[PDB]
From a paper:
We identify structural changes associated with electron transfer, proton release and water delivery at various regions, including QA–QB, YZ, the OEC and the O1, O4 and Cl-1 channels.
From Δt2 = 20 ns to Δt2 = 30 µs, the QA head rotated in a counterclockwise direction, and this was accompanied by a movement of the non-haem iron towards QA—structural changes similar to those observed after 1F. However, the difference densities associated with these structural changes were much weaker after 2F. No difference density appears on the OEC at Δt2 ≤ 200 ns, suggesting that no structural changes to the OEC occur in this time range. At Δt2 = 20 ns to Δt2 = 200 ns, there is no difference density in the O1 channel.
Author numbering:
A (entry chain E): 4 to 84
B (entry chain F): 12 to 45
C (entry chain D): 11 to 352
D (entry chain C): 23 to 473
E (entry chain V): 1 to 137
F (entry chain A): 11 to 344
Write the structure that this text describes.
Amino acid sequence: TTGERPFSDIITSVRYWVIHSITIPALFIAGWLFVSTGLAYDVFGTPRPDSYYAQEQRSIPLVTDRFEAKQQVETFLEQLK
Amino acid sequence: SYPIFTVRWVAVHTLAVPTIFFLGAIAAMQFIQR
Amino acid sequence: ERGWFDILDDWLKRDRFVFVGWSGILLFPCAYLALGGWLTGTTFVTSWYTHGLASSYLEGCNFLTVAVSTPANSMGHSLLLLWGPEAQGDFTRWCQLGGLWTFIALHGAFGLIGFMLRQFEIARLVGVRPYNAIAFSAPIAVFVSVFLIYPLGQSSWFFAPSFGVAAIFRFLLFFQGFHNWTLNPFHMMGVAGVLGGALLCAIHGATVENTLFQDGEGASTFRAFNPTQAEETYSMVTANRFWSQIFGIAFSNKRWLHFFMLFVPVTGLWMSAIGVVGLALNLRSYDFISQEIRAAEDPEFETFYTKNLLLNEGIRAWMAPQDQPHENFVFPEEVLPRGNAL
Amino acid sequence: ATNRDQESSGFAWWAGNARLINLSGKLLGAHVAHAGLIVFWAGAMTLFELAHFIPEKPMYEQGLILIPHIATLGWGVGPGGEVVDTFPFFVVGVVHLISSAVLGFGGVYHAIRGPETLEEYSSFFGYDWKDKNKMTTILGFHLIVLGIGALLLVAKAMFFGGLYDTWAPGGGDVRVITNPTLDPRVIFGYLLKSPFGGEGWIVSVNNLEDVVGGHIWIGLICIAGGIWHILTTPFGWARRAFIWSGEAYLSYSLGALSMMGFIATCFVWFNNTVYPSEFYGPTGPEASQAQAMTFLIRDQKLGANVGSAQGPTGLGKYLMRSPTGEIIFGGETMRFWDFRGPWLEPLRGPNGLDLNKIKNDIQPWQERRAAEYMTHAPLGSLNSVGGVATEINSVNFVSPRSWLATSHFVLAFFFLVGHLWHAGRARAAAAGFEKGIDRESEPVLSMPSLD
Amino acid sequence: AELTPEVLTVPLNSEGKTITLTEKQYLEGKRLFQYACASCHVGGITKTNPSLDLRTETLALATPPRDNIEGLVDYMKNPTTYDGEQEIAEVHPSLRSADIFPKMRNLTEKDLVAIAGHILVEPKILGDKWGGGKVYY
Amino acid sequence: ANLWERFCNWVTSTDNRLYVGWFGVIMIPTLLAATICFVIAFIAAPPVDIDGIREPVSGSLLYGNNIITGAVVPSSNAIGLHFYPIWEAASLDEWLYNGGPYQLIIFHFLLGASCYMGRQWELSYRLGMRPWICVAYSAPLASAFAVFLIYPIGQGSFSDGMPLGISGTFNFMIVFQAEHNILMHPFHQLGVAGVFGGALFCAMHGSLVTSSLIRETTETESANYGYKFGQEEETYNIVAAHGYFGRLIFQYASFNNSRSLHFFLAAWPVVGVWFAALGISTMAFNLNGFNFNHSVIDAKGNVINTWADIINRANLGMEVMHERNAHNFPLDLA
Ligand code: CLA
Ligand code: CLA
Ligand code: CLA
Ligand code: CLA
Ligand code: CLA
Ligand code: HEC
Ligand SMILES: CC1=C(/C=C/C(C)=C/C=C/C(C)=C/C=C/C=C(C)/C=C/C=C(C)/C=C/C2=C(C)CCCC2(C)C)C(C)(C)CCC1
Ligand SMILES: CC1=C(/C=C/C(C)=C/C=C/C(C)=C/C=C/C=C(C)/C=C/C=C(C)/C=C/C2=C(C)CCCC2(C)C)C(C)(C)CCC1
Ligand SMILES: CC1=C(/C=C/C(C)=C/C=C/C(C)=C/C=C/C=C(C)/C=C/C=C(C)/C=C/C2=C(C)CCCC2(C)C)C(C)(C)CCC1
Ligand SMILES: [Cl-]
């Protein structure tokens, strides 16, 4: 043994479960709200189902320049009306 | 008898804490409609 | 001299539940970041602006179709640092430009270095020979040749494999249609090493389990073994007679047997890596010139080699426009190769 | 806790059911409880299928495997396989579901309440695996039960409404079977047919008179053999050829079930008589022949002479000859010319497909049947996207024949592995070296060296 | 991009009258199309006769014209050949032949409109993918 | 000591350099027949009309093949699943044109290899061994049945069985992808884990045992001379190996029981290959890999492509080109 407390000891102790009956659901709900508030879309820049294309276009907003790539994406995002 | 905050404790939680948050994020996605 | 270096050394090498070591300073952050980046990217990040593809759980992909996809072809072989001239510190733009791909690939590469240093480090403390580290050079040779050397020979990172299940399947099929990679003898040797390794694994495991000495009374034979016993738990002599009579030849040197089990899959992976180094330059085993000369002149000459090239040609023409959107291929229906009816 | 740990029994928990080998009373409970599970699934699954069943859709569009079995027996269907009354399906499900509680009850009682061994309690129900006379007597009881079961199919066919006959003149219908085939040259002639293309061994049975008459012979044979094995004990040649132990008897059964699983796989894949395509969808050969038929019909209506249309290879575009001369459909379906089905046979003459019947006698119901089967070919993805592997999403379909064939090949394969596992173990345990080699008595050390 | 009322506006008849479907109608049309039609018409092609597809341009040149709700609803009652010369109810599913095509027995007039609407709207979404076949998959 | 008993004692003798046995009595002639026909056909057989369309494919060395392109070509699609022994042909020339040899080779081979599996059981009984080495061999054996017999059965023709050649194997794999999307099938995926995992654990076990060899030699000699065939004592220190690998991962991820270690080595590739064999055998009945073509749709209804859709494009290329002259109607239903 390496001295840490056995896992089977810890996860059958009431104190473990008093703590983690709160911390586990709290993290789950935090993750749910990251999505349900729509925050995940804006952090990572991921299209919503209604923002892949403009209403009549069918071309991909594909990046084609290396050093103006950032401006190209910003331009594609404006053209969504 | 035993400590509470060890290296093992940190290793466990750097993995377990984001896992639960991600599981909740992915569960919410199952209700997104187009 | 018991300075801070030696005190630090003491703490790093404590016998804990997770050994750390000096190698752990490199291994743990890079491994964790490479895994966390793959999970973050496959859960939340799109491939719309680099590939025209949805690629995350957020967008409705499943475990088989999510990926962290390669950057756009226009990025070349850019390191794509978050603070570099493309993303310019913008975390959201960085994600849209494919910065997670180089992030995962580069932290992964240094993470692999760290795991192999860990194998050396632990082996030196325990006092065993470092053959486990030596065997791990083959996964490193594969990772480096496929994820780094190969795109570096090509036009850009875009043509490297993307980190996802179905994305890797597309990589396999791209290699058939464009490189005729099944024809390549360096791939053939790798196939031999992988399948011969799985064979050796199966047959050595089964031979040991069916030449066990009766060292206990229970019908479960697992208990009748003690890690510190001095005797072999199975009969090498009965194993040797069985295979000599079933197969003609058999192992007789148990040390040779286990070195061979190291040798076969490791040599395989190394051979496959060399062939991919060639594909970095399109230096393919694509054709047999003698077959092409005969087939060009003799329209009744047909082999399974000529049949497969026709499949490759179908793969290239039908997948290229969608798989290489930056090229802007417009192939009218009338130019597409097709058999009758289909 | 008699034999309920590894120390007493010698078997670890993951081989825990091996602890039951010499506890006939608990072993009885395990077997009865398990039969209850089988009867439960049959009843519950039927009710699930019925609840999910829309009578206006073909059964094969709805993921049904049990209702097709009931409909084939003549319950709930009329001409053309149309569903006329879903009540028999309800009955069959409810009665299996109710019976599973009786079996569950007995199984749980014997397993945990009743006597652990039966030999002290009753010498009739008690048994010793090594008692060759008692084992063949139990075997004989079960052969008599099996024989009665086969006669129940005969009784349904001849006295209680009949069977669904896909070949019946007029599009398929329930028909009473009045003259079952009894000529043993016909019945046993099926057993000596080659299993290869155009012959098909017993999978080729193609009429109900043969099916019914074959069950008369099997019924009598089982009853007789059951009487024989009650009255006899194994002969000397048999005594010396077998291993006589519980695990050995298990292994023989596993081999038998594997064999049957593989046969069932082919039956459901090729046979369209006892697996009617009205209920199960067309076979693979059937849908492929149906495509050729559909395009022959379309092109002929446009004015093509399909008899003389030369295809790109030099073979006929629509029609060609089989290797023995029969006129057959062309294209890649040339491999399926052994297909026989009620919608196609009116076009058949002595030489195969008859060009005069093709030109003049193709009825709209045949065009309908062929277009339906061509678009319900047993191709489809694991997530039930119907069609070739390159098809887009839209059609939620996988043929019942694909579900039934794949599941039973997988089951049959693992049951062959289980036969090898337990037959090899039974041999080793009987001879006494199933736990390893005795160090002081290692046989190979007493043998001359090979070189 | 979004499923807007403009997308959902389609010709009602040959005289130029339009009708605007609801999202619920369009989605009901898609479900009913999969139920009754997609086994031969998946993607707007025709598996048992690929010469005829469900592209609006093809439907416009049918006789009588089928590129509007009334024409398509009439086709599902009494289908004809492309030139109108023959009645094909005996080999094509329709209300007239619901006895031999049982899936048509539980379609109502309101269902036919929804299916018709699906067929007219999908090309406006999918472009060439509708009726294009494998080349555009 | 009558003559039958004498023959039986020779057949089952544990003293023959190669064990014969009762399975060997079927094995030896069927494997000889298949081997001799294979070698002759591989060198000298004339071209074969595999797809039944009078378009013969050349497989042998004398007709323009090298080792990589050569094959014994599967029998004609016109034959389908019909039995075609030499005596069903009007001449040897007919038999050869129609791919007769393929049927003779694979039927003798499948018989012989099945008996090779029983022979493994049989000798283990004569030597007092445990009986399950043959269970491990059932996984490669089942794979051979899948591609030479089961897949032809479900598809209706031996012409879609795997060719007996290197490039022929590749052709089989490519068309299999087009028609079943085998990459997207979980059983092929388990097969890959079976053989990738099998190769990993092979190098793993070999490197750990080699790392903990007990010093018995000088540096000028091979360490392999430190083990002597038949010796009573183990040649490496499994406790040192466990102590290394336990610290590499964590202590409880490491085996210290050699018997369950070696059981794990046996089970992982064998179970994985069983699933691979069951993938081929179930796709034989057209229950194909996952289809996510056009699964992701935007708000308006535009198709949003995934990597699955790029795979589909590649599959379509393989589909439209394979057997370019053999289809007259639009659906490749078998
Ligand atoms: C069909 C599946 C099946 C069946 C019928 C059995 C049956 C049996 N097992 Mg086996 N076993 C199985 C699967 C099965 N097993 C599996 C999957 C494993 C691996 C985990 C094992 C591992 C195993 C071990 C290690 C052992 C057994 C033993 C036994 C026997 C005694 C069990 C006991 O005393 O429990 C007592 C348990 C209870 C009293 C708790 C509840 C039990 C009841 C029956 C639950 C049923 C509830 C049901 C819904 C009620 C319906 C009632 C209604 C009809 C009125 C019994 C005959 C034992 C044995 O061999 O004894 C000699 C034994 O040691 N089994
Ligand atoms: C009617 C058929 C039958 C019967 C009565 C037996 C009976 C027995 N077997 Mg045998 N066996 C069989 C078929 C059968 N087997 C088949 C078909 C195979 C091939 C796979 C085997 C392979 C086999 C092996 C390798 C061994 C046995 C052993 C045994 C003995 C102990 C079994 C036990 O307690 O398992 C306990 C049950 C479990 C531990 C549970 C297994 C869980 C399975 C794998 C899950 C399967 C997945 C499921 C189908 C779907 C997924 C579910 C999930 C999504 C929830 C017992 C005498 C042991 C023995 O030799 O004793 C003498 C032994 O070592 N069997
Ligand atoms: C003979 C077996 C069999 C067959 C051929 C079918 C066939 C079918 N079922 Mg039924 N069913 C069965 C048994 C079977 N079922 C059982 C045992 C249950 C209770 C769990 C059900 C309960 C059920 C429900 C509730 C439903 C169906 C439905 C269906 C239809 C769709 C199937 C599907 O999409 O699966 C999806 C595919 C899978 C889930 C793949 C499973 C992979 C398994 C886990 C692999 C196991 C391998 C092996 C056994 C383990 C070996 C381990 C090794 C170590 C030895 C199809 C007609 C559906 C339907 O359409 O009803 C009308 C439906 O809703 N079935
Ligand atoms: C094959 C299954 C089977 C077998 C071999 C046995 C055998 C036995 N049972 Mg068990 N049992 C079973 C199933 C079985 N049972 C079922 C399904 C139940 C729930 C009903 C029970 C509930 C049960 C209880 C509560 C008791 C037993 C007892 C016994 C012992 C004495 C029985 C006797 O002498 O009856 C004499 C014979 C008869 C009374 C004739 C019965 C005829 C049946 C009821 C009519 C149907 C016959 C026909 C073949 C059924 C076809 C069913 C098929 C469609 C599934 C004997 C060892 C006794 C025991 O263990 O003593 C300690 C005891 O107390 N059994
Ligand atoms: C579940 C059903 C069943 C089982 C398990 C048994 C089991 C037994 N029977 Mg019984 N028997 C049965 C049903 C059964 N029988 C029926 C229904 C009848 C009436 C026909 C008989 C009539 C009968 C007689 C007259 C005798 C037995 C005997 C025996 C014993 C010897 C078995 C043997 O050596 O077979 C091995 C099989 C053979 C030796 C057959 C020849 C070998 C050929 C070449 C194998 C061919 C395999 C091939 C793949 C076939 C595929 C299908 C084929 C039709 C084309 C054994 C205990 C013997 C005994 O000891 O009686 C006391 C005996 O003399 N049985
Ligand atoms: C296969 C059994 C089919 C089913 C199910 C459905 N359709 Fe069909 N359709 C089919 C064929 C063979 C044809 C051509 C018929 C001919 O000979 O002209 C058609 C044609 C149509 C058309 C006309 C297309 C055009 O003129 O371009 C329409 C509008 C049509 N079909 C609609 C339709 C609907 C709405 C269906 C579900 C109720 C349906 N079809 C099913 C074959 C099959
Ligand atoms: C990138 C990046 C970063 C990082 C991040 C991180 C680090 C993250 C992490 C993350 C994580 C860490 C996550 C996780 C997740 C997890 C998950 C999501 C899981 C899931 C699972 C499941 C689902 C399971 C399943 C299963 C299996 C697998 C088998 C068994 C059975 C079962 C079924 C259970 C930073 C910030 C630095 C910077 C920027 C960039
Ligand atoms: C021994 C043992 C075991 C086993 C057990 C078993 C196997 C049991 C079975 C059991 C069973 C097998 C049971 C059954 C039951 C049943 C029931 C209980 C039923 C009921 C029914 C009902 C109530 C019905 C109803 C209805 C109607 C009538 C109408 C329609 C609708 C409905 C459905 C509602 C185990 C493994 C656990 C382990 C331990 C030992
Ligand atoms: C119902 C029906 C029918 C009929 C049927 C019949 C009549 C059947 C019979 C069957 C039979 C009649 C079968 C048999 C079988 C047998 C077997 C399967 C056997 C086996 C054997 C064995 C296994 C052996 C083994 C061995 C050897 C070889 C050596 C020595 C040792 C031993 C013993 C191990 C028909 C088709 C008409 C139609 C449909 C329905
Ligand atoms: Cl065709």
